[PDB]
Ligand binder design. Sequence first.
Ligand SMILES: [Mg+2]
Ligand SMILES: [Mg+2]
Ligand SMILES: [Mg+2]
Ligand SMILES: [Mg+2]
Ligand SMILES: [Mg+2]
Ligand SMILES: [Mg+2]
Ligand SMILES: [Mg+2]
Ligand SMILES: [Mg+2]
Ligand SMILES: [Mg+2]
Ligand SMILES: [Mg+2]
Ligand SMILES: [Mg+2]
Ligand SMILES: [Mg+2]
Ligand SMILES: [Mg+2]
Ligand SMILES: [Mg+2]
Ligand SMILES: [Mg+2]
Ligand SMILES: [Mg+2]
Ligand SMILES: [Mg+2]
Ligand SMILES: [Mg+2]
Ligand SMILES: [Mg+2]
Ligand SMILES: [Mg+2]
Ligand SMILES: [Mg+2]
Ligand SMILES: [Mg+2]
Ligand SMILES: [Mg+2]
Ligand SMILES: [Mg+2]
Ligand SMILES: [Mg+2]
Ligand SMILES: [Mg+2]
Ligand SMILES: [Mg+2]
Ligand SMILES: [Mg+2]
Ligand SMILES: [Mg+2]
Ligand SMILES: [Mg+2]
Ligand SMILES: [Mg+2]
Ligand SMILES: [Mg+2]
Ligand SMILES: [Mg+2]
Ligand SMILES: [Mg+2]
Ligand SMILES: [Mg+2]
Ligand SMILES: [Mg+2]
Ligand SMILES: [Mg+2]
Ligand SMILES: [Mg+2]
Ligand SMILES: [Mg+2]
Ligand SMILES: [Mg+2]
Ligand SMILES: [Mg+2]
Ligand SMILES: [Mg+2]
Ligand SMILES: [Mg+2]
Ligand SMILES: [Mg+2]
Ligand SMILES: [Mg+2]
Ligand SMILES: [Mg+2]
Ligand SMILES: [Mg+2]
Ligand SMILES: [Mg+2]
Ligand SMILES: [Mg+2]
Ligand SMILES: [Mg+2]
Ligand SMILES: [Mg+2]
Ligand SMILES: [Mg+2]
Ligand SMILES: [Mg+2]
Ligand SMILES: [Mg+2]
Ligand SMILES: [Mg+2]
Ligand SMILES: [Mg+2]
Ligand SMILES: [Mg+2]
Ligand SMILES: [Mg+2]
Ligand SMILES: [Mg+2]
Ligand SMILES: [Mg+2]
Ligand SMILES: [Mg+2]
Ligand SMILES: [Mg+2]
Ligand SMILES: [Zn+2]
Lengths: 43, 52, 98, 50
Amino acid sequence: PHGGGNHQHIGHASTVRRDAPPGQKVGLIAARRTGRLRGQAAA
Amino acid sequence: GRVIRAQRKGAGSVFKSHTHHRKGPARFRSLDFGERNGYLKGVVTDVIHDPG
Amino acid sequence: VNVPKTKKTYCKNKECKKHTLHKVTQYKKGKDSLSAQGKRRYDRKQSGYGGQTKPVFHKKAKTTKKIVLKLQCQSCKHYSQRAIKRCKHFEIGGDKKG
Amino acid sequence: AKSKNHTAHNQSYKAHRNGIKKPKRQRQASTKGMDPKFLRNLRYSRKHNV
RNA sequence: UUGAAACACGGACCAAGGAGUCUGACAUGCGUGCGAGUCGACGGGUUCUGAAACCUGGGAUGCGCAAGGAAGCUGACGAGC
RNA sequence: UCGUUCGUCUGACUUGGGUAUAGGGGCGAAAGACUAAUCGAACCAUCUAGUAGCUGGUUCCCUCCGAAGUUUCCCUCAGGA
RNA sequence: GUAAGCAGAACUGGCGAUGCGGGAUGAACCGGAAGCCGGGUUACGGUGCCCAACUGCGCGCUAACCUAGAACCCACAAAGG
RNA sequence: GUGAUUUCUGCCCAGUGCUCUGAAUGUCAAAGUGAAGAAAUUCAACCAAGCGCGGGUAAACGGCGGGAGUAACUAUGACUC
RNA sequence: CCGACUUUGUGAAAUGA
RNA sequence: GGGCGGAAGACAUUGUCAGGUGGGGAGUUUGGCUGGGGCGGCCAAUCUGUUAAAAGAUAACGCAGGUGUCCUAAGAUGAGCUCAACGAGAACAGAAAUCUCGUGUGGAACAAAAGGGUAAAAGCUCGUUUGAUUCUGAUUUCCAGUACGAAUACGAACCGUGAAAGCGUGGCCUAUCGAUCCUUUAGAUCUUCGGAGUUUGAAGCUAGAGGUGUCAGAAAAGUUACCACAGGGAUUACUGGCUUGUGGCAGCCAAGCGUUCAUAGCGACGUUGCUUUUUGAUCCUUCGAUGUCGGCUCUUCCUAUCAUUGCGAAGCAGAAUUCACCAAGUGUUGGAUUGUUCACCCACCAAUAGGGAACGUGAGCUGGGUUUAGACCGUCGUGAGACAGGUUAGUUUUACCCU
RNA sequence: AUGUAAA
RNA sequence: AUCAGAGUGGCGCAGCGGAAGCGUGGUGGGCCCAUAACCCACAGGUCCCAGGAUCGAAACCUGGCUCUGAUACCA
Ligand SMILES: [Mg+2]
Ligand SMILES: [Mg+2]
Ligand SMILES: [Mg+2]
Ligand SMILES: [Mg+2]
Ligand SMILES: [Mg+2]
Ligand SMILES: [Mg+2]
Ligand SMILES: [Mg+2]
Ligand SMILES: [Mg+2]
Ligand SMILES: [Mg+2]
Ligand SMILES: [Mg+2]
Ligand SMILES: [Mg+2]
Ligand SMILES: [Mg+2]
Ligand SMILES: [Mg+2]
Ligand SMILES: [Mg+2]
Ligand SMILES: [Mg+2]
Ligand SMILES: [Mg+2]
Ligand SMILES: [Mg+2]
Ligand SMILES: [Mg+2]
Ligand SMILES: [Mg+2]
Ligand SMILES: [Mg+2]
Ligand SMILES: [Mg+2]
Ligand SMILES: [Mg+2]
Ligand SMILES: [Mg+2]
Ligand SMILES: [Mg+2]
Ligand SMILES: [Mg+2]
Ligand SMILES: [Mg+2]
Ligand SMILES: [Mg+2]
Ligand SMILES: [Mg+2]
Ligand SMILES: [Mg+2]
Ligand SMILES: [Mg+2]
Ligand SMILES: [Mg+2]
Ligand SMILES: [Mg+2]
Ligand SMILES: [Mg+2]
Ligand SMILES: [Mg+2]
Ligand SMILES: [Mg+2]
Ligand SMILES: [Mg+2]
Ligand SMILES: [Mg+2]
Ligand SMILES: [Mg+2]
Ligand SMILES: [Mg+2]
Ligand SMILES: [Mg+2]
Ligand SMILES: [Mg+2]
Ligand SMILES: [Mg+2]
Ligand SMILES: [Mg+2]
Ligand SMILES: [Mg+2]
Ligand SMILES: [Mg+2]
Ligand SMILES: [Mg+2]
Ligand SMILES: [Mg+2]
Ligand SMILES: [Mg+2]
Ligand SMILES: [Mg+2]
Ligand SMILES: [Mg+2]
Ligand SMILES: [Mg+2]
Ligand SMILES: [Mg+2]
Ligand SMILES: [Mg+2]
Ligand SMILES: [Mg+2]
Ligand SMILES: [Mg+2]
Ligand SMILES: [Mg+2]
Ligand SMILES: [Mg+2]
Ligand SMILES: [Mg+2]
Ligand SMILES: [Mg+2]
Ligand SMILES: [Mg+2]
Ligand SMILES: [Mg+2]
Ligand SMILES: [Mg+2]
Ligand SMILES: [Zn+2]
């Protein structure tokens, strides 16, 4: 799903839903949050 | 499209575990009357490296 | 477009066959019945696989509709229906011109 | 590629190959389309001729 | 092809093969037979070179002999210029 | 393929044999690369004489008659009525 | 449209579909349309040679030391001297 | 996803996406339920997930402005609207 | 992913009719 | 003690339906015209004027505009009146408020574009009204003499108005709109549901409405530089051809410059040409292929002459320089940067003129650029990908035939 | 927020 | 090159035909020894230009003028 393009980029949100079909569920599966962990969420 | 790499692992073919040099499963001993109601004495004989 | 609430025109009923005073209302389409043969045949055609089987119109261009008037004469209580030219704003029995 | 073309060239020649036909002149011309009141009476007058 | 001797394409040469056919439905024209009829086309009978030919059925098989109506239905009373 | 010149050479090294994965499938240190000179979907047979408003061709003589590139409609403009 | 051997119309004719005589040569310019022949006469165009037919009879103009000039279309030449 | 080590990774959760939460008096099927009817049926109430409502999230996809004036030479603009 | 029915039995309470 | 030992437990699970999600995957689509195509526009339905050549018809992505509406009156009819504007008058009152008289062929008004039409009206004011009605035929415009739209003239009715004749079948006339199938409505105290009935439901007959604007009417998004096929010189990108706007060269006239002097040298405002090394315009040739930039190499040709030879003129004293003629015989270089043509500097030189030959020259080379497939950046795009943006790596085949 | 260079 | 956008108080901006304002700036008093800040009042407009329709326009169509963004590809 991430392949292709004149520059290497994803082009869509890399977080995919839990109920995505196999072959579609690549990236950050059913992610509740992204980004660097800070403060309470790092605890 | 074609079947992606994540999908190819469930078929096993080249993605099976590499276990030719492994030493067997690691676990307790099947629980019996001896271990329920007292104690069984064992002696450690070797400490061995398990590949993987 | 304003239309009077009553109107005297010909009535074609065999008990009138002359100009009588009529009551003027507006036509609205009756709700479709599920037991019309066209509806039945279509529901049978849709069942199963193959997806949409009849065309679905998309390319609307008309921004108006021809208004139909339902004229009920006040002697036999039978209706006649006549369409008028397409209009955006329509009113029956509205306030008269000055 | 310019696909629209109109002309009347050669058309009068084609018209005159088999002549500009005129319809045959007829005794007792047709009454279709005349005044119906006039035509009923003409029919009734002929009905009662002796 | 508007326009080919063409700086448009195909063609080195020779022999042999090589492309509007068969079938079904319909139509007009023409030929044949019979004619308000006409078909014997599925069968049967008979037939000794013939899978042919010849006979038979039909009182209603097809088409025609009557049409207008969505239908229920009704169905041409006799032509003058 | 050949000549000269080049990269690497104790390592994620080179290599034989055995074995596993098969076609919208495999396998990929990723080039749509490789899968028997065949890969942006192998090869073989069949459906199949697939369809083509498009290109090519379309076989004897004489005699007689002899055009059209215009109208209307068409997802119609290399077509058809 | 600056124009175009350009694009689009109106009337007629031609070429396309057509050979033949002339314009050296040319699809539509001029003459003229056609079976195979003999004889005569013409059309357009010509008559010094090429090339059939007068170096014919007349009158003027031109002298180019720029390739004088010399064929409807047609293969230009202008303002100005 | 990025690409040794070094130094550093700013602002944006409004959009798209992912995710968390269910008071209930939004919407949302089959089945089940009630009514009317002679029945077919119709009508009403109800209706899980989903969506909507409310949170979170950028080392998720991504994004990260204009227009005027202003210093005692002039220019410039720390400053202001 | 979600509901009904089926598998699918047993018996007890609270609001419900 | 007839429980192998535990955990969950009638929930999981299974089976069948129901709703939601589902480019993970399947199938398919992604108009036309078009001075190539694309982008733009709509010249696709459609009106007025003009082009249009005094009957009718008549084209272009021709010209100036218009249409998808609006109206219970802005429809019908009867009666009365007369409009735009101007002149002369009346407290506040003036350019302009209201009133009065005169003139007034329409110079106003008539829903909207344009054109036509209308004066006891077709305009304005008032009265009364619903002919903006029913039935089916006919004809005209379009045209195939088909349909639709629209319009016209009768027939058979029922009405409005007016004393009446008359007028009235929408809008003063020319545009203002829509098949089959389907659904929905109205009409008959209608026809059928095929064993006969009652009776819901359904199905028909006639006439409307719900719409197809690509407007005689499919249900429809991209990308391809990884690409394929059938064709096209009906059609682009290069040479060649026509043209010559643009590019380049050259004339004529002479207002002025040239310290005084139009013409030594120039030459404004105007105007006539030539050229075919530019580009534009066109689409005639070539798409069963004519190797597509530049340089290198080599030859030849032109003159619109830079230098070299011989001259004429000058605001030519000399030296130098400028204009012009005859003249293409000879010559026109070495380098830095750029793939470059072009350019621009350095230097020499008598001078470092200008061009053609399929923008000479790839079976002569080269391959730097451009111009496939790998890859990076920036901008764009949700994405696949795009870039007349920059970057880097990327095969240059054959002669032995004729000349 | 602050306070003539003009003594 | 065409095309979208925008011209309104000194400046930046709103304005849906009955029709002109918001912030800031200007002017005159007050407070202060005196300036700002604060308080009370006051005055502002060729609505880019020329039309045209319109009960009636800064607004609605047309022309003219000036600033800004865009799309311009296959060769
Ligand atoms: Mg994919
Ligand atoms: Mg990508
Ligand atoms: Mg890349
Ligand atoms: Mg992006
Ligand atoms: Mg079924
Ligand atoms: Mg189903
Ligand atoms: Mg044609
Ligand atoms: Mg051709
Ligand atoms: Mg040639
Ligand atoms: Mg060919
Ligand atoms: Mg050949
Ligand atoms: Mg043979
Ligand atoms: Mg019979
Ligand atoms: Mg080598
Ligand atoms: Mg070695
Ligand atoms: Mg070695
Ligand atoms: Mg090996
Ligand atoms: Mg091996
Ligand atoms: Mg690639
Ligand atoms: Mg065949
Ligand atoms: Mg062809
Ligand atoms: Mg031909
Ligand atoms: Mg002779
Ligand atoms: Mg990341
Ligand atoms: Mg960051
Ligand atoms: Mg956000
Ligand atoms: Mg968010
Ligand atoms: Mg339900
Ligand atoms: Mg819910
Ligand atoms: Mg797909
Ligand atoms: Mg096209
Ligand atoms: Mg074009
Ligand atoms: Mg004429
Ligand atoms: Mg005429
Ligand atoms: Mg009158
Ligand atoms: Mg008609
Ligand atoms: Mg009448
Ligand atoms: Mg009127
Ligand atoms: Mg309809
Ligand atoms: Mg029906
Ligand atoms: Mg029955
Ligand atoms: Mg059409
Ligand atoms: Mg595709
Ligand atoms: Mg591309
Ligand atoms: Mg020129
Ligand atoms: Mg020029
Ligand atoms: Mg051509
Ligand atoms: Mg060409
Ligand atoms: Mg070609
Ligand atoms: Mg070749
Ligand atoms: Mg060729
Ligand atoms: Mg060649
Ligand atoms: Mg010369
Ligand atoms: Mg060559
Ligand atoms: Mg290269
Ligand atoms: Mg590449
Ligand atoms: Mg690029
Ligand atoms: Mg050789
Ligand atoms: Mg200070
Ligand atoms: Mg200070
Ligand atoms: Mg003050
Ligand atoms: Mg103060
Ligand atoms: Zn009645």
